[PDB]
Design an enzyme around this catalytic site. Structure first.
Site, PDB file in Angstrom:
ATOM      1  N   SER A  10      -3.667 -10.965  -3.726  1.00 48.74           N
ATOM      2  CA  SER A  10      -3.235  -9.593  -3.782  1.00 48.74           C
ATOM      3  C   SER A  10      -2.380  -9.180  -5.033  1.00 48.74           C
ATOM      4  O   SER A  10      -2.339  -8.219  -5.721  1.00 48.74           O
ATOM      5  CB  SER A  10      -2.507  -9.006  -2.405  1.00 48.74           C
ATOM      6  OG  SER A  10      -1.006  -9.735  -2.568  1.00 48.74           O
ATOM      7  N   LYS A  16       7.377  -9.998   2.835  1.00 46.21           N
ATOM      8  CA  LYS A  16       7.619  -9.609   3.969  1.00 46.21           C
ATOM      9  C   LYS A  16       8.943  -9.903   4.595  1.00 46.21           C
ATOM     10  O   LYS A  16       9.650  -9.643   5.529  1.00 46.21           O
ATOM     11  CB  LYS A  16       6.630 -10.101   4.986  1.00 46.21           C
ATOM     12  CG  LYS A  16       5.238  -9.417   4.659  1.00 46.21           C
ATOM     13  CD  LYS A  16       5.222  -7.913   4.769  1.00 46.21           C
ATOM     14  CE  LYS A  16       3.903  -7.427   4.821  1.00 46.21           C
ATOM     15  NZ  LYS A  16       2.918  -8.193   3.907  1.00 46.21           N
TER      16      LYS A  16
HETATM   17  C1  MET Z   1      -3.883  -6.772   5.840  1.00 49.52           C
HETATM   18  S1  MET Z   1      -2.823  -5.486   6.212  1.00 49.52           S
HETATM   19  C2  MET Z   1      -1.200  -6.399   5.855  1.00 49.52           C
HETATM   20  C3  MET Z   1      -0.657  -7.323   6.648  1.00 49.52           C
HETATM   21  C4  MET Z   1       0.633  -8.157   6.034  1.00 49.52           C
HETATM   22  N1  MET Z   1       0.153  -8.608   4.893  1.00 49.52           N
HETATM   23  C5  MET Z   1       1.467  -8.953   6.936  1.00 49.52           C
HETATM   24  O1  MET Z   1       1.875  -9.861   6.609  1.00 49.52           O
HETATM   25  O2  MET Z   1       1.230  -8.959   8.245  1.00 49.52           O
END
Ligand code: MET
Lengths: 335, 339
Positions: free
Chosen positions: A279, A57
């Site tokens: 994941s 992210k």
């Molecule tokens: C569980 S849907 C994905 C959300 C995403 N993993 C976040 O960091 O916000």
């Protein structure tokens, strides 16, 4: 048998955001030693936890905020706000600290406490929502917050924002260059779906026949048309189809049981020394299931690893102890 | 506002995770350097050793210790690796052992770093958990017993006395040299084993005359300066003794840093530069800012080692105090000691 470590980068980076991306592609060997996986089939994992805040992210929080500032959508005087399963809030805190903007966050109470703990030290502001309601509850929490208000907040909107998806054009170029155009199959576990779609759309510009494979929890197989259900693969299984998802770019969807995702992750750190998150265990087991198919003999399979097991120490990831030899454990995963 | 571009593709496929060790990034600090006594000319850079696959400088050390032992035959099929360590060296040994195919035994007190226990166990390590009250010396005593009773069975990593620890940092030094295009003037390193500060000094002093080398230790346990050992809270440094691999001739100056300042500096760095460094990095950065304020250092390039990241410290008090004050108040409070 000789082993060379990494050479100097020959760059001085102007701030931490310039160190995002260019993540390493690493061959798996331990978990691939299996009589049905043929010697020429290459199984490579792209380790997104080499980003400065250790997750995929980082690319997302960076691109969303930086474009919004270049755009005019984020301007001096506004704050940032969002809902996350964790990693996105941390990535937006990193971008917020560098660019000088405050950051506010909503997240399910059930996500690991390590995530809650990182936000704040940077300079953020938290709100934990009900587990049961999951990502939709967080989202509602967020809407609540803006409803009123002025033209004060920029909403990151990670499930609907195309700057999410577009950040993964870099992810795709790195896979292309690192494999010298040899990649055949990409496997990506899906949360927002920005990785699977962004990678797919940029790779299809490179070569039409690349097979793109999404992975989701068997217990919440929403991409395959099932309903939202309780699962434990943290970081994926949003419980809805994100608005940035583009089904025409995805060739196949693989459901993976929560317990199996965790057990695969256990095996990857033990037999390859790679400390992948939950994941990642789903994505890698899907990729191994691809690698034993006779039509994939000799193919190059690239699997996204979005996070590090160390953000999951408070969970049950490393709780249960698997019985058996390596071959036993792999047999139990593949069958 | 400048174009910010992210990193380019590595253009490599790595045979295994140990090949991703090293080549760590050198990053400019800007937020924490904005104080009147630091000049616009001077360059203050941090080398982020938490870009290693297990997020600390010790990846280099666990790798090279095991690799060099395999190469020269100190480690051979049949033997097992052992070390007494409650930190990063333990994780780094487990990583290397996982990839090379050797069992790893790690001894530590049963009450220390239970998060780090879990990490080690995940990598397949046997943990040797020793009595709590006894601290690190009880772990060492157990490892001594196990090697006495099982002659020939174990290879002892011996991080405080193994020259393969220092030698790994010739690579660290080379990265500093190439990344700065030879312009590095000062290297600041907070000292645990001292592998980093000595192995970087050994190699850089070969490149150029006049590179100043600065060791950093806790004000409360200033054993390199010749004070007595003492309790301090700067995890990863201040071992309480001068390590066997320490070579004082290669070190130009030693800076003592108080625990509470090291912590406060690490909080400022994540808030103002967005770099989530660890406790010992808060010590080394504060030492380096104190250099960048010396008028004789104007326009110099100062390289500070950042051994680890703040995520490994979430259960500590590192982020408990919420500092009051604007950025300038905080930096002025950190740089304000006289002398
Ligand atoms: C569980 S849907 C994905 C959300 C995403 N993993 C976040 O960091 O916000």
């Amino acid at each position: 048998e000789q082993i060379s470590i990494s050479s100097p980068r020959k760059r001085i980076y102007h701030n931490i955001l310039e160190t995002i991306g260019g993540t390493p592609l690493v061959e798996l060997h331990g978990v691939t030693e299996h009589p049905r996986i043929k010697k020429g089939t290459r199984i490579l994992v792209k380790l997104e936890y080499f980003n400065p805040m250790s997750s995929v992210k980082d690319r997302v929080g960076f691109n969303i905020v930086y474009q919004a500032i270049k755009d005019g959508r984020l301007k001096p005087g506004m704050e940032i706000i969002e809902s996350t399963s964790g990693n996105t809030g941390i990535a937006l805190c990193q971008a917020g600290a560098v660019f000088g903007y405050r950051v506010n966050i909503a997240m399910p109470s059930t996500m690991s406490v390590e995530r809650q703990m990182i936000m704040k030290a940077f300079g953020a502001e938290l709100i934990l929502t009900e587990g049961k309601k999951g990502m939709p509850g967080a989202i509602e929490e967020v809407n609540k917050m803006i409803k009123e208000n002025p033209g004060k907040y920029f909403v990151a909107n990670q499930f609907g924002n195309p700057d999410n998806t577009a950040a993964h054009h870099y992810t795709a170029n790195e896979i292309w260059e690192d494999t010298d155009g040899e990649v055949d199959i990409v496997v990506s576990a899906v949360g927002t779906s920005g990785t699977v779609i962004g990678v797919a759309e940029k790779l299809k510009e490179k070569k039409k026949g690349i097979k793109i494979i999404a992975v989701e929890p068997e217990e919440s197989a929403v991409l395959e048309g099932k309903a939202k259900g309780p699962h434990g693969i943290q970081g994926i299984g949003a419980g809805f189809i994100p608005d940035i998802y583009k089904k025409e770019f995805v060739d196949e969807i693989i459901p993976i049981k929560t317990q199996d995702a965790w057990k695969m992750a256990r095996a990857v750190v033990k037999y390859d020394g790679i400390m992948c998150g939950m994941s990642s265990g789903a994505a890698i087991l899907a990729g191994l299931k691809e690698a034993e198919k006779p039509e994939n003999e000799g193919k190059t399979i690239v699997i996204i690893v979005p996070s590090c097991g160390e953000r999951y120490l408070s969970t049950d990831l490393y709780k249960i102890k698997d019985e058996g030899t390596k071959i036993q454990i792999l047999d139990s995963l593949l069958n």
